[PDB]
Each structure stands twice: as C-alpha cells, then as structure tokens.
From a paper:
The PhoQ PD is a member of the PAS-fold and PDC-fold domain families. Unlike other PDC-sensors, which bind small ligands in a defined binding pocket or PhoQ PD homologs found in environmental bacteria, the PhoQ PD from bacteria that primarily interact with animals has no apparent binding pocket due to an occluding structural element: α-helices 4 and 5.
To test this hypothesis, we engineered a PhoQ PD mutant that contains an internal disulfide bond predicted to restrict conformational dynamics between α4 and α5 and the α/β-core. The PhoQW104C-A128C disulfide mutant was designed to inhibit motion between α2 and α4, allowing us to determine whether the dynamics of α4 and α5 play a critical role in activation. The protomers in the PhoQW104C-A128C PD structure are highly similar to each other, with an average root mean squared deviation (r.m.s.d.) of 0.3. The PhoQW104C-A128C PD is structurally similar to wild type and has increased stability. The work in this study led to the construction of a specific S. enterica Typhimurium PhoQ mutant that is inhibited for activation by acidic pH or divalent cation limitation. This mutant has wild-type virulence in susceptible and resistant mouse models of systemic infection suggesting that, at least in these models, acidic pH and divalent cation sensing are dispensable for virulence.
Numbering used by the authors: 48 to 187
Amino acid sequence: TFRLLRGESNLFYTLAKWENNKISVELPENLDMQSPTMTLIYDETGKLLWTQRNIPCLIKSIQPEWLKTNGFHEIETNVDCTSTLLSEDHSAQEKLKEVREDDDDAEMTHSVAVNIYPATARMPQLTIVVVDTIPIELKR
C-alpha cells in the first residue's frame, strides 16, 4: 500500500524540476495515463505546487496535518468526486453510474500516501502525495 505508492512518489520526485519559484513536471513519452494514481506536490509549508489533475474536491479533501510527515491516510469523499476522478475510465464509469443510482451521496474512501523529500542542493523540501484513484468500496 504505502510501500507500493512510494514508487510512484519517487518517480514524480525524479521527474520534477525547480525553476523560477515554480515546479515543472515533464511526463515521460508514452507514459501510461491509465495508471490508477494521481500525484500532488507541495512545498514544506503545505502550499500545493503541482498536481497531476486539477480536481478541487479531492484537493480540498487532502488534510493539511498529514502533509508534514510520511504517512498512510484515507480520503473520505463522495461518489460525485470519485466519478470526476475516474472520468476517463469506462468500466469504472459504468459501476459509478450504478452506485450513483442506488445512493447519490454514497461515500467513497481513497487510500493516500504522503511522502517527505528533504531539501537537497538540487531541490527544496517537498511533500509528495499519491492517491489511489480506485476507492476501497469498489475494489471488490
């Protein structure tokens, strides 16, 4: 889980560059866009610097306390938000349709790994957050 999302976090760390008070992430050519993760990068103060996808409901669901340490956490969000997160994913969209019909405020829980990268000569201190886009309720 955490140990598993750590790999994606490390990847995005090595992909990132710090230039002119800004994070830039250049994605590798032909990289899978269909991986079930979304990564966010914050500064040590907890300011969001970069996000793989701009999804405000999920971003607002990230608790600031979490951001100062390494940890494994859970987002408690809604089926509307999860549907926005999984928009491109066809099959998932079918399932999501179903669940939306049974309950329109159905709760969705997403695993999250928070990862700390101390400042180096190359890079300032960063917190990298990796979210499992498939919620616990849909894993089975």
